[PDB]
Symmetry: C3
Subunit: 178 residues, 3 copies
């Protein structure tokens, strides 16, 4: 079964301003593993067009945080509202889609950190060009005031000069809680 966003271009996400972006996320449960497919289009706000070269105050990284309550429902501090993830019909409780707590343990301590296995790195590309890389860093169960979390960190090193944040797709998997 599948927990997913809509697939259209309509925004569902706040990075900078309300509804400035569309995170397209498809989570497919394949037994003990979630098969995940993600893309990001930014449609408004300061990250729509990366102007790092002409705006030194613009960040070169941002997060999209899916903070889940114990039930597997999004919490308000997430970048996406809980209504924007639904089950796909005959092809709540979403604990079967949550990142496994034994594989991806929370930091033990204020002064401890997670194991690196809680993280996946990938490279995605802006405006469909191989010379516009962005590092996508996906971390499990590393957020305060949440039962489970999936955090998508987007970061880049190039002083991009009017490049639209229209990202290529990325596939990954993670171990499911149950």
């Amino acid at each position: 079964l599948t927990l997913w966003t809509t697939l259209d271009p309509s925004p569902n996400c706040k990075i900078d301003i309300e509804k400035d972006s569309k995170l397209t996320l498809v989570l497919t449960k394949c037994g003990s593993q979630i098969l995940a497919n993600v893309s990001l289009i930014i449609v408004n706000g300061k990250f729509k067009i990366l102007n790092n070269k002409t705006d030194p105050s613009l960040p070169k990284s941002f997060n999209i945080k899916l903070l889940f309550d114990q039930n597997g429902v999004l919490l308000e501090n997430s970048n996406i509202e809980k209504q924007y993830l639904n089950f796909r019909s005959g092809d709540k409780n979403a604990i079967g889609f949550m990142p496994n707590l034994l594989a991806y343990a929370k930091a033990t301590t204020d002064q401890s950190k997670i194991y690196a296995r809680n993280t996946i790195y990938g490279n995605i590309y802006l405006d469909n060009q191989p010379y516009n890389p962005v590092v996508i860093k996906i971390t499990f169960n590393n957020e305060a005031d949440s039962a489970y979390s999936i955090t998508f960190n987007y970061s880049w090193t190039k002083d991009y000069d009017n490049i639209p944040f229209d990202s290529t797709s990325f596939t990954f998997s993670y171990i499911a809680q149950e």
Copy 2:
């Protein structure tokens, strides 16, 4: 269920000359997502051995296009004939394997382009060496005179000097039409 090529080394593909290559492609339907595994061996023609260094007329990129009719059957202009994709037995209509039209919309207009989410980038390696990279660029639903398409673009920047096009394997996923 699975839509796949044969797994042997026998050629099934024309890049340059007839039957000059074997695209090994395994598509596994996992609900709403296709889990895809691809490799390429070039056995004849001008791309069998990359001689860019001693032949400046040789391209540094080529496409393998799977152009599908509405039924999910290959069209003649594809690099592979329709007979070379089959269902795996008790483990036509292949619309369940086709790239989703809402997620991967065609270009609206002669002067418009697709969203970047229609594309996946990866790096694969020739002759099993990490110093022989090739960019594999997979694009959905971006081809003229086709209902659906999967295009594999292979490109490289090194002036390769007698390197066999014997590629490492690559895994990806995409959202299914139905």
Copy 3:
């Protein structure tokens, strides 16, 4: 169904010294393809902390070899004992998890080599930093005195200076024997 290690941090692997490492490996059968998720934590021995900069005798690569008998059970020369892979309960014979012999043929001859499609390359990161890359090279069916094999080769080029071998996660797939 799933063939997996435990998910805790407890070591299950010998790279240098007994039980010096935890390979977390989850293999999910999705019809004709195995969906695979791997991470590595080194907890003891010479690779726990990479000190290449101050120990020129330390290798910059090592293997973790899963050598399978015909039944799909680990052989003693593997880096992991056979007890450390088990089936996940109602969600031996593990031939359904073995790398396909037609897709991933053994070398024909003492002087022959495998096709490159028997290999996957990826990049993973140590201590959750994008400036600590390691090349993960996964090769199928390329080991002496084994029916099937999955070999994880880890290699790096940086003279790492006291970097813990605490790896990020990596997803891949391969074609199943049956």
